[PDB]
Amino acid sequence: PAATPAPEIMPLTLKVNGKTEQLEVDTRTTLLDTLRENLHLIGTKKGCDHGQCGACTVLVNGRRLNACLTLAVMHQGAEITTIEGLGSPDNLHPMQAAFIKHDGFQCGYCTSGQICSSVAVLKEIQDGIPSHVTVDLVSAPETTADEIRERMSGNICRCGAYANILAAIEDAAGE
């Protein structure tokens, strides 16, 4: 029309990588944009903003999700874990170290997402969650290459580091 409404601003408490944050946010703000623009936790990336790429993957109460497709205000009091919460250069997570060893990235832009997903995927398998490639639906899935490829398919890498990403995940899973 000839006008668009002013922001509705709400108080929000998030626990992000172990730390209590108290924010005032526009209700429209996604978890992705709250992390990046409000909290300056720029490790979580924006590849598409419409759920198509996985570059914004984070963990919310342990479960992976695409942070571009959830509102910050939907997660009052939740525990959020981003790539920064998994490790840093002087204290690398085993999955970060595995990605380095196997060269599971090139440009680095999908990598935060790949790593957060990888960690969650191993846990989803441990939890007995099946996938599209699980043949025996009633029994517990095994950690196989096929299972990992399917369960990671929501993280797109345009560089095409996939084969190395799989090698990193399998190394990390074996340890």
């Binding site: 922001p7 720029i42 590849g47 250069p89 440009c107 680095g108 935060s112 996939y162």
Partner: protein
């Protein structure tokens, strides 16, 4: 340093650090979310405003009005930038379409306005209120419809003729005449194009996502009409480009204009849905190949014509060049035909010209080999040329295509292929094996660097070269470490900033070889300076283990800088060896595919690439390049297409769901072998490009494997199941 004679023995030959599969030195930053990309520089502008792009709603016509009052009044809005209020602009030499449209609209989603606001959400919301009204004009959107009318080459690009093609084709014992198409393709780099601008008086700093720092600086300055000296460009980390970030795009221009108008830093990202039409794309091609051979299978006649389209003054897709050099044949014709299309700007994407040219040529060769009754690997070997076929006194610098193919065939188990198509099943899957050649020239460009030996013994490399995920940080560190005799972990490398010396940038797969060669040049001077500091002749001095030695005497790098740091700044320049010799790179691609006998779904089972790309500088990051290119070739072969609506004049499936790139589940076993192809004609590094070579031939090897699986030739890519379904077996 002027490189005009082939390289002799030099320090890089020691290969203590160069040639070794070192971890990427940017790995700790990139795996921990601490590498900063263009939209992430918060400390540099903590109160940066947000600009949100408005793109043309029509393909082509006139912007009758562009009203901004409602947007200006929207919550949090600071200003709205338009062509009308931005002032007269220049145009960069690498932009065909204007980066800011109005009053003329040249393509769908061409930028026409930017709303600047206090927050992202407020900017986005206000952008919906910008009132654009248009008068459409008639456009040309179908390459196929335009073909009939273009039968002459561009003025500056005349056809190339050798011997008597027409006569020889008539005389040939066995021949093919076939037409092939490739669609418009999109880069889909995972980082959306983005930039942040800050002005300090008349000085501009732009943080951006760009492959070519110096071109960016020059082009942005020309567009803004400001002195180039007043512009600093910064792009140390780039989330992929694949050609799509070679040039200045609308994000950079609009950020810069906006920040100057509101007297405050502004950052602008192109939203993913706007990228495929706003930016550039690989042009679709329509290619006609006529190839004949004699009774022994020697090609005698080769003709390759290609049609592509672009906006007026835009580039053709150079899809016939490889056909001038790849196979022997005394009678040859090649030609380009360029239509005018009012789609978005066509431009470079990974291996421009060779990627689609080989997508056609390498099927045609498979067809001709089949017709001749000759194994397709043997057929290519039989037709190898070690000289330029148009100038047989001109040698390739070196050429190991035969060896790529033989090594590949052996490793892949090519002899286990059933040469009769359609006879091999694995459950419900038809299995097939295919091969193709890859080819890509090696190009040389001037490149410079500054290298410092610090007082603590560490080495600092500065150059404006970019690392777009290629590995430049690492290979430049390896080069300096090798030259100075220091451990890799003692070298710091600073990239992608116009305050550093001018490199050749990331493009044309010249980046690794040229950037490392400039570091070579700087290090040779630094070695002289070190030698002089300790009183040795550099001609007789060796550098190893943090020491310099000369016959009987020894000294430590520490001692040489007791006086202060030593700094060398040099460039490499290239003479006429690329005219004297043809410098190229080669591959053999071998693929096994499965085709579902019921549904026609295509799934790749195994891929092998064998590459000859000079001396490999880091086999781990080089392998990544090739598997990455293998994946992008799978895309091109099986799923990637920008769907043209030839009424509305745009690419329809314009996002990261509609335009389909390969996902984890698509990826087979991928193996890469690098032949030792050390090429002293190339440079002091003896390296050649690989990042584009890796893609060349991949898609046709997949197509040829699909043919071997099914017996169905598909000559219009991508090869999707709807092109196979009605010729599969009965269920």
């Amino acid at each position: 340093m002027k490189f005009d004679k082939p390289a002799g023995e030099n320090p890089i030959d020691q290969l203590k650090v160069v040639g070794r599969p070192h971890d990427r030195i940017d790995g700790p930053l990139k795996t921990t979310g601490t590498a900063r990309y263009a939209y992430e520089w918060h400390e540099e502008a903590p109160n940066a405003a947000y600009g949100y792009i408005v793109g043309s709603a029509i393909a082509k016509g006139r912007l009758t009005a562009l009203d901004t009052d409602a947007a200006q009044k929207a919550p949090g809005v600071l200003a709205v930038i338009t062509a009308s209020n931005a002032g007269v602009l220049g145009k960069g030499d690498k932009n065909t379409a204007r980066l800011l449209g109005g009053p003329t609209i040249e393509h769908y989603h061409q930028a026409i306005a930017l709303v600047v606001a206090e927050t992202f959400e407020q900017a986005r919301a206000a952008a919906s209120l910008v009132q654009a009204h248009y008068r459409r004009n008639k456009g040309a959107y179908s390459l196929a419809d335009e073909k009939q009318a273009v039968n002459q080459p561009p003025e500056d690009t005349p056809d190339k003729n050798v011997g008597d093609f027409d006569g020889a084709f008539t005389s040939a014992a066995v021949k093919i005449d076939a037409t092939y198409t490739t669609p418009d393709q999109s880069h889909m780099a995972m980082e959306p194009h983005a930039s942040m601008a800050v002005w300090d008086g008349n000085k501009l700093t732009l943080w951006t996502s760009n492959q070519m720092i110096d071109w960016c600086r020059t082009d942005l300055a020309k567009t803004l009409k400001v002195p180039v000296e007043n512009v600093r460009i910064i792009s140390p980390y780039i989330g992929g480009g694949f050609g799509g970030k070679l040039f200045l795009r609308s994000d950079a221009l609009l950020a810069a204009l906006a920040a100057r108008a509101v007297k405050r830093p502004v950052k602008v990202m192109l939203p993913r849905p706007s990228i495929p039409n706003n930016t550039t794309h690989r042009p679709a091609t329509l290619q006609h190949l006529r190839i004949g051979a004699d009774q022994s299978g020697k090609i005698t006649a080769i003709s390759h014509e290609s049609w592509s389209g672009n906006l007026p003054g835009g580039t053709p897709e150079t899809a016939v060049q490889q056909s001038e050099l790849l196979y022997a044949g005394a009678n040859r014709h090649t030609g380009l035909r360029l239509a005018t299309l009012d789609l978005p700007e066509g431009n470079a994407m990974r291996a421009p010209g060779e990627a689609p040219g080989l997508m056609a040529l390498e099927i045609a060769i498979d067809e001709l080999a089949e017709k001749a009754g000759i194994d397709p690997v043997e057929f290519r070997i039989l037709n190898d040329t070690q000289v330029d076929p148009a100038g047989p006194t001109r040698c390739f610098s070196r050429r190991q295509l035969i060896e790529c193919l033989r090594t590949g065939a052996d490793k892949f188990g090519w002899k286990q292929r059933n040469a009769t198509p359609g006879q091999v099943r694995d459950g419900e899957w038809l299995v097939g094996h295919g091969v193709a050649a890859g080819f890509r020239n090696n190009l040389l460009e001037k490149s410079g660097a500054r290298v410092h030996l610090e007082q603590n013994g560490t080495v600092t490399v500065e150059t404006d070269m970019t690392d777009i995920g290629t590995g430049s940080y690492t290979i430049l560190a390896q080069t300096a470490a090798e030259m100075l005799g220091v451990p890799l972990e003692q070298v710091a490398v600073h990239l992608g900033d116009s305050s550093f010396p001018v490199s050749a940038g990331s493009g044309g797969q010249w980046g690794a070889n040229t950037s490392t060669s400039g570091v070579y040049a700087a290090c040779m001077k630094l070695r002289e300076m070190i030698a002089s500091a300790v009183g040795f002749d550099p001609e007789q001095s060796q550098f190893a283990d943090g020491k310099i030695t000369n016959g009987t005497r020894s000294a430590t790098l520490h001692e040489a800088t007791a006086g202060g740091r030593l700094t060398a700044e040099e460039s490499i320049e290239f003479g006429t060896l690329s005219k004297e010799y043809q410098q190229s790179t080669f591959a053999g691609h071998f693929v096994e595919v499965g085709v579902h006998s019921a549904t026609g779904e295509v799934r790749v089972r195994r891929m092998l690439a064998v590459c000859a790309a000079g001396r490999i500088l880091n086999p781990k990051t080089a392998r990544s390049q090739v598997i990455g290119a293998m994946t992008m070739g799978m895309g091109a072969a099986l799923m990637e297409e920008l769907a043209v609506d030839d009424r509305l004049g745009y690419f329809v499936n314009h996002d990261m769901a509609g335009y389909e790139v390969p996902v984890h589940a698509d990826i087979p076993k991928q193996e890469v072998i690098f032949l030792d192809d050390t090429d002293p004609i190339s440079s002091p590094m003896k390296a050649k490009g690989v990042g584009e070579l890796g893609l060349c031939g991949v898609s046709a090897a997949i197509a040829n494997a699909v043919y071997n699986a099914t017996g169905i030739r598909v000559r219009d890519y991508p090869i999707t199941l709807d092109k196979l379904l009605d010729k599969l077996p009965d269920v």
